[PDB]
A and B are shown apart, each in its own frame.
Chain A
Amino acid sequence: GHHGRMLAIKASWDESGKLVPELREYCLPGPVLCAACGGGGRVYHSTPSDLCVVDLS
C-alpha cells in the first residue's frame, strides 16, 4: 500500500489436504514511496526517512 499496508499470500495445502491460501497483512511504517524485490525472499522498501528491508525467507 501507500500508507504502509503489506499483504502476503502463499499456498498451504495443510491440515485438510487441499490447497488453501494462507494470507498475512503486515503494517510496515511510513508512507511507502517505492519498493522492489530481492532474490531470496527479500524486499527493499523506502520511507521518506530511510530505505528499509524485509526478509520473508
Chain B
Amino acid sequence: MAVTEASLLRQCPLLLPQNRSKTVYEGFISAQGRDFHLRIVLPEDLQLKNARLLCSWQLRTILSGYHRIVQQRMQHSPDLMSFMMELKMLLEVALKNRQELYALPPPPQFYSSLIEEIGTLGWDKLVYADTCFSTIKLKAEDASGREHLITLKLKAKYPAESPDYFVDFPVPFCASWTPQSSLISIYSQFLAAIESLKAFWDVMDEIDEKTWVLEPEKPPRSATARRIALGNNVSINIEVDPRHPTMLPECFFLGADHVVKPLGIKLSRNIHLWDPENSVLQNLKDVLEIDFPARAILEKSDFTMDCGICYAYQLDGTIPDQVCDNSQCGQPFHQICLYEWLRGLLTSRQSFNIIFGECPYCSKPITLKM
C-alpha cells in the first residue's frame, strides 16, 4: 500500500507493535525461508537518528561486519517501513555471501530417493560417494573394455536443479537435465557420448600401445595431443579431431632441419595415399613409409637427454625439442635456455619470429622459431 499503516504489515508481516503508541515493535524478520528475532524500540516520536535495535545473537553473527552500514542506514533512512525493507535486502546479501555457512539437505525427499535411484542403476556401477553425500562418482565400460568415470555433485535439492556433472572426455559433454530425468537418464546419455567418441579412444589407445608416446606421459582421457617419438632425437606431435579421428590430424616435425626435410617432402608427396578407413598408425606407416620404435628403451636409450645448458628435463612443462642440425652434436636444448643463450650473443640476428645463431657445443648454424 502507499501509507505506512498497511504497507508495513504487507512488507514485514511478523513485526507486531506491542505498545499502544506504536513505539515498541517486536517480532521476526524473514529472509530466504528463515525467521529472525528482532526488537525495534523507537523514541516517543518517529525518528531513526536515535532508536534502539536489539537482536538475537543469531542476528548479530549474521550482521557481523555490516554493523557500520545499519548504524549509518538508521541515520540516513527516512521511515521505519523503508528501514525494514532496506535491512531485509542487506540481510539477504549477507546470507547470499554465507551460502558456504547456511546449507542443508532435507532428510525425507532426498536420502531415500537417492538410494532408490542408485539401486535402480546397479551397485556394480557406483565407485565413490562422499560422507556429506554431495559428491558421488559412477563408472561405465566401453564396448572396447575401458573404464570411464563420471563425477556428479548433488545439492540439497537433487531432482529440482541439475547436479554438477564432471567428465574427463575431451568434447564438451552436454546433459539435457529435466526435473523428470534422473541419474539413469544422464547415465544413458553418458554411455551414448562414450559410444560416439569410441573411435577416438581406440585411436589414442593404438597410439599409446604401439608407439613411444612422449609428452602426454601417462595421458589423461581428456588429452587430444600426442607427441610421438620416431627414429632418434626427432619427434612428430599430433593433434586429432574427436569427431573425425580417422581423418588426417594436424601433424608436424621437430628435430634436425636436414633430417626433418625428407619426412615433410615424403608426407607432402604421398599424403593423397592417406585413407580414413584404416587406423592412424596403419595410415601413417604407409604414408610416411617408415616404422616407429616400440619402447627402444624409453627411460634411458643412450643419450644425456637433458638440456645441455640447464642439464635438466621438464623445465616448466617444456621438453628438450630444439636440436642441432648436425650429426656430431645432435644436442637437444630447451626453447627457453637456447633463446636466452642466443639473444645474448653478438653473432645472432633476429628476423620476424626466428633467431639464427651458433649451437653452444659445436658452433654450427642453429635456428630457433618462437
Contact = CB atoms under 8 A, between A and B. Distances in A.
Interface of A: 12, 15-16, 20-25
A20 B61 contact: no
Contacts of A23: 61, 64
Contacts of A22: 64
Contacts of A25: 58, 61
B64 A24 contact: no
Contacts of A16: 65
Nearest to A21: B64
B101 interface: yes
Given A20-B65, A24-B61, A24-B101, 10 more contacts: A12-B65, A15-B65, A16-B65, A20-B64, A21-B64, A22-B64, A23-B61, A23-B64, A25-B58, A25-B61
Interface of B: 58, 61, 64-65, 101
Could you tell me the dominant secondary structure of chain A's interface residues? strand
Contacts of B101: 24
Nearest to A14: B65
Contacts, number: 13
Contacts of A12: 65
A4 to B, nearest CB: 15
Could you tell me the dominant secondary structure of chain B's interface residues? loop
Contacts of B64: 20-23
B303 to A, nearest CB: 46
The 6 nearest A-B residue pairs measured at CB? A23-B61, A20-B65, A23-B64, A25-B61, A21-B64, A24-B101
A32 to B, nearest CB: 19
A51 B65 CA distance: 35
Contacts of A21: 64
Contacts of B65: 12, 15-16, 20
A36 B241 CA distance: 58
A22 B66 CA distance: 11
A15 B93 CA distance: 14
A21 B101 CA distance: 15
Nearest to A12: B65
A29 to B, nearest CB: 14
A16 to B, nearest CB: 8
A12 B279 CA distance: 59
Contacts of A20: 64-65
Contacts of B61: 23-25
B334 to A, nearest CB: 39
B132 to A, nearest CB: 13
A21 B61 CA distance: 9
A57 to B, nearest CB: 16
Nearest to B97: A15
A22 B58 CA distance: 13
A20 B65 CA distance: 6
A16 B66 CA distance: 11
A25 B58 CA distance: 9
Contacts of A24: 61, 101
Nearest to A7: B61
A25 B61 CA distance: 8
A21 B65 CA distance: 7
A8 B61 CA distance: 10
A13 B58 CA distance: 22
Contacts of B58: 25
A46 to B, nearest CB: 20
B107 to A, nearest CB: 14
A22 B101 CA distance: 11
